[PDB]
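User: Can you write out an input/output pair for a complex, sequences first and structure second?

Assistant: Here is one pair. Inputs:
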Amino acid sequence: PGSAGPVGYSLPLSPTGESAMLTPPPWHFSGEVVMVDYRVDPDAARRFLPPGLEPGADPGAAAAVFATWQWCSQDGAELTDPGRCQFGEFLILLSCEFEGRPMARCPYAWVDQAVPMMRGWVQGMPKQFGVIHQSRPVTVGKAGSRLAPGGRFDGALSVHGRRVVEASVTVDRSTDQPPALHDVPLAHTLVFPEWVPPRPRLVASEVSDVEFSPIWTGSGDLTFFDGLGDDFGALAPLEVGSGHVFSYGETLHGGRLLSDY
Amino acid sequence: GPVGYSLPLSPTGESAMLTPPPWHFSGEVVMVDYRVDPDAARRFLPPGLEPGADPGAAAAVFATWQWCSQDGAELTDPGRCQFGEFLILLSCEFEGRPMARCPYAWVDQAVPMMRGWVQGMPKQFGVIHQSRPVTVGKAGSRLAPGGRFDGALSVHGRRVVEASVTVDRSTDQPPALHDVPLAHTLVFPEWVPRPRLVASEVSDVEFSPIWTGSGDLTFFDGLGDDFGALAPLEVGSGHVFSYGETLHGGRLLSDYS
Amino acid sequence: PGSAGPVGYSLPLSPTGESAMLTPPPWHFSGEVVMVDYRVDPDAARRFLPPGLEPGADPGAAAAVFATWQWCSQDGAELTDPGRCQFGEFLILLSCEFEGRPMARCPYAWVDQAVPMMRGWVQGMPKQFGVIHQSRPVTVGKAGSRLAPGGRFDGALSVHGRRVVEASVTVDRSTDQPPALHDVPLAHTLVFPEWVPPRPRLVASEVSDVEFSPIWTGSGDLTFFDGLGDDFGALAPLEVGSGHVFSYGETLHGGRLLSDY
Amino acid sequence: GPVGYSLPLSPTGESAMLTPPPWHFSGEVVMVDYRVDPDAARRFLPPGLEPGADPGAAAAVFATWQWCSQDGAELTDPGRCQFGEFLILLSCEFEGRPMARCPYAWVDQAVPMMRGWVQGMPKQFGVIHQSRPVTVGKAGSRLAPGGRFDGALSVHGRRVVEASVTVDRSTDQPPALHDVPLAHTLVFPEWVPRPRLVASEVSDVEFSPIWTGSGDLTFFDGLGDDFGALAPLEVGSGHVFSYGETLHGGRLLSDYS
Ligand SMILES: *[C@H](C[C@@H]1CNC(=[NH2+])N1)C(=O)O
Ligand SMILES: *[C@H](C[C@@H]1CNC(=[NH2+])N1)C(=O)O
Ligand SMILES: *[C@H](C[C@@H]1CNC(=[NH2+])N1)C(=O)O
Ligand SMILES: *[C@H](C[C@@H]1CNC(=[NH2+])N1)C(=O)O
């Protein structure tokens, strides 16, 4: 009501607010996921947990998650421009707990589009830019795999021209049991660098209307390669477990404060 | 000396950019049938290719593909086996047999581009986007009545084509221009100072059920007056479906001798 | 000294701090610029000036600025990886004043790399992602222009697959007079969206060791196209003035608060 | 029917992806001379091309180019007239005359890639980065003693080559492998079930002063054992310079009849 200067949910500010790079939440997501469960060094994982987050009930449980998404705002406007509403993503997830409640920590994430990257920082998800590839199921022809026993699906991440992660799943059966780390709240750290010479906050992403397709599960394989530094390398798999292929949706509304310390 | 199906030659032949056919394709298509000026279409038909039984029938075709060679090796590297594509198709005939001519095509990966020229398909490079059906959540459309699917092509940073389909029913009737042989012109520029009309030989052609509904198509400036001549006079039905084929090689229609 | 959780100048946090996407300033920049001075609707320009910034001494003075940069941190480490240390940029600049002192406001900017984009938001420069092309001078052969009378240089910006801006300069003489809008402080608005249900600050970017090559100046041409919305379109040229081609360097240290309101 | 120097054919010929030669090039080069296993190099030489007077001499060449046709039209669209390139060169001879063979090349734009195959230059697609000299500020090197310049190539998301040069002096001596004719193999895959050895004809070859100093070069895995066979045994001098030429067409060295 009072406002004088230019406005907007985000930069760039403009007289009408229409120029802003980001739209206010809620945002809807619909995606396809290729995920591998793995065993991480629990002491290594612990060092990525900020104060307030404790080790998971199974401290060594981790996951590598490839996904391709479509997203839109409440009005659905972005959906008519597929170039604007799609992105690929790779995440690491670590098991943790907040006040006794299972959650996941995402210490590393990459995406291949700028809007999702910046929107990640708004939520505290530490998204960087990368090149991200993922197999898609086919239903006709021979050039791919079906969502059926024996179907194989692969994921790859490169960053700055170097291969960082490769994952594979060969599915053998369908279940109605969502993978644990993809079915708990994510606990992020909101912090942004200080330009004029920071107060981090631990937040949970608030979601609704979480939906999974049937889950196709089988063997998993996962390989980390050099090219992201030793801090990242500490989270490489000790052992690799089951892989999972499924579709996922949710609505993301905003943050809930877990601790402002 | 060094060998290979294609450049670069190498001692074992492994370095070649392209592998020998056959190649398998599995793709997701968003296609719009439209009416083109028949006189404009005729001017894109080389000798031997005559106007369709329906000279004005054309189509704009967006697709996303996975492909592989006979051994399937490319499938394990999604970054190497995937590409997006936009094509124009024109109805024509050769010796009384219905076919389609592709006067323009764009892809977003180099191997499929070069492989296109091998077959005579006139692929250039572009930026190509296409809606994907969803089955969970709210951020997209289902393959079901009322589902909408969009396609866009930009070239050299300029928007060139936008298409949309809103489906209303499923059928087992493949879109006509996507179910006839393609007749290409095999020609490569002379570097040291002879075109052939060929058809792509395919097998194991497979369609999913075809979701069909309204179609919409717009051409924008940015590719020149020759291309603009093929802009729609009227836009017909749209179709969303999956498609597979195996592509084996070429068959000579004419070498003009 | 006390720190427990993972750390870093920016996300992602890590045990050593090495994983952070951004490095602390200062950052050094060395670039090549193709710039066109133009006349903007002063009333339109005014609406992009937040409280505290007044219209420029010449309220209708604006510029369109294409640049290609190399950048590095104090240790110079980024320079050995050209893919990491280079980016292209397009900016709009508007003339304004703070407490009587000439400055420039950048209402819109685009870059083609993720690190520079995020670093822009840290400073309040409203960078989005785009495709940005710019001619470079040649010194041998025929496939280009020399930095000499008659030399022509072009710039183009596309965003989401649509052409947004095209500029051209044909130079006819060399001067030692830096273009006014490229030789004054930039006044940005620091603001980041609030995730847990904003306090903007007006800041100036503090720079040192500003250096210009000889300036090649001549006719300018500039065209805006649709595809960024009516707020942006309000800043299209009424008339187009001189163009300038030159090399530029500076060291960027941090922000100085102009007003926290 | 429709015409054109290259596909796609069109009624006026304007749609063609490629324009007829001559084409002008102006580029900035970062090059490292190195020693290759002569036996490995020999295996990449087709019949008619014999080992160099110095069989082990090779070079790794990074360049950034602007190009245009005779009318200069492409120059006004920087996005259409610019590309980056990485090449391997091997010393060889044809009928006693020194030449260079390019067994591998990569570029980052589609037109130059296709145009390469027209000439017989075995270009593939890659991601190619190269340092640029600066003249103001601190974020780079000057073309002056102690200046360092780096090059990198990735293909399909894997790093393949890194090179570096630290210059110490200026000379008027063009690097040998960048100052001899290139001998290519013109061949295109048969689609309906005959290579030629050709040289690229150039004129108006121009070098800036050559800044020369130490060179460093590393190959990484990621392209196969054939390519790996050309990895350096030893690395020599590096050179940073500007280069221009006009490329007119091909001259037949042999058609093997
Ligand atoms: C980034 C984060 C989304 C939300 N959940 C994900 N796995 N990715 C964004 O908002 O685009
Ligand atoms: C290019 C051509 C393919 C075959 N049919 C198409 N619609 N695209 C290629 O071989 O990759
Ligand atoms: C973004 C901003 C730089 C600083 N000045 C510019 N003109 N661009 C960044 O820090 O990379
Ligand atoms: C590819 C080949 C050019 C000519 N000489 C080079 N080093 N690259 C093209 O024609 O664009």
